[PDB]
Amino acid sequence: ASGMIVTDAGADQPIVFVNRAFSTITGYAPNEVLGRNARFLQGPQTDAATVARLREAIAAARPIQERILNYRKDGQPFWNQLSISPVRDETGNVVAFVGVKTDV
Amino acid sequence: ASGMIVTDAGADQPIVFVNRAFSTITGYAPNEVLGRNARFLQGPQTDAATVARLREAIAAARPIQERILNYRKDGQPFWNQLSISPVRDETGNVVAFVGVKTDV
Ligand SMILES: Cc1cc2nc3c(=O)[nH]c(=O)nc-3n(C[C@H](O)[C@H](O)[C@H](O)COP(=O)(O)O)c2cc1C
Ligand SMILES: Cc1cc2nc3c(=O)[nH]c(=O)nc-3n(C[C@H](O)[C@H](O)[C@H](O)COP(=O)(O)O)c2cc1C
């Protein structure tokens, strides 16, 4: 199943919701991740240029897809086919971001 | 502040998350709405044709915007400028629905 992360739009995009699949994939319970930026999923071999593209896309509220190296709670690396999109209201204001870890 | 509702994709789209603004707007606390279909917000003067258009859009996972009459927990009617979109993974599978009540 595909994991889903929802964050606030502003400040440092703290996580406000993760689905059940997220916990299966990552080994983290909601209470371990809520109120944190999702960058804690990254680790020593995560590609800097990929992180830079995510950073610029989120800052511009542009949808982006990247395959990024993440780490489970237990430290085991996994490939995250990650897609991030802004959630906008009808005035164009960004209300949230949604991230999907696609089950390929 | 715009309200946001996140539901599961399947079965009867149970609510899995609401933002703070949702509680301000509707008078319902998260624990009062989690696991329910959002149709409880409708009442006696809600337009049946508008409900039917939402029903068909969600069944087909099509984005839709409607101005729909909803009711606060205390019975106060309010106009909901509602936009619903599917959250898709990169295979096209629907992972969730997101609804926004646009603050006008
Ligand atoms: C909704 C959302 C979900 C995200 N999910 C992930 C994820 O699953 N894995 C990951 O490495 N980064 C994820 N990020 C990205 C990081 O939170 C952060 O934006 C990225 O590392 C670039 O910014 P930074 O250089 O400040 O860390 C997500 C971001 C958002 C807004
Ligand atoms: C994510 C999401 C948010 C929704 N938010 C609302 C809402 O704020 N108000 C409302 O009247 N209906 C909302 N709905 C619509 C109802 O849940 C339902 O789909 C609609 O009443 C039509 O289906 P029905 O004829 O089976 O009730 C939402 C649906 C989804 C998937």
Residue numbers in the entry:
A (entry chain B), B (entry chain A): 48 to 151
Paper text:
Flavin-binding fluorescent proteins (FbFPs), engineered from prokaryotic and eukaryotic light, oxygen, voltage (LOV) photoreceptors, are promising fluorescent reporter proteins. Their small size (about 10 kDa for monomeric FbFPs such as the improved LOV (iLOV) protein derived from Arabidopsis thaliana phototropin photoreceptors) and their oxygen-independent fluorescence make them ideal reporters to monitor transport and anaerobic biological processes. Using spectroscopy, X-ray crystallography, and quantum mechanics molecular mechanics calculations, we provide a firm structural and functional understanding of spectral tuning in FbFPs.
To verify the transferability of the blue-shifting Q489K mutation, identified for the plant FbFP iLOV, we introduced the corresponding Q148K mutation into the recently presented thermostable CagFbFP protein from thermophilic phototrophic bacterium Chloroflexus aggregans. Altogether, we were able to obtain three types of CagFbFP–Q148K crystals, all using the precipitant solutions with pH of 6.5 (data and refinement statistics are summarized in Table S1). Interestingly, the protein also crystallized using another precipitant solution for which we obtained crystals in two crystal forms. In all of the obtained models, the C terminus of the protein is clearly unlatched, and the side chain of the introduced lysine is facing away from FMN as was found in iLOV–Q489K. Thus, the succinimide modification present in iLOV–Q489K does not influence the backbone and the conformation of the introduced Lys because this modification is absent in all CagFbFP–Q148K structures. Therefore, we conclude that irrespective of the buffer and post-translational modification, the C terminus of the iLOV–Q489K and CagFbFP–Q148K variants is unlatched, the LOV core domain is opened up to allow solvent ingress, and the introduced lysine occupies an extended conformation facing away from the FMN chromophore. The photophysical properties of the CagFbFP variants are relatively straightforward to interpret.
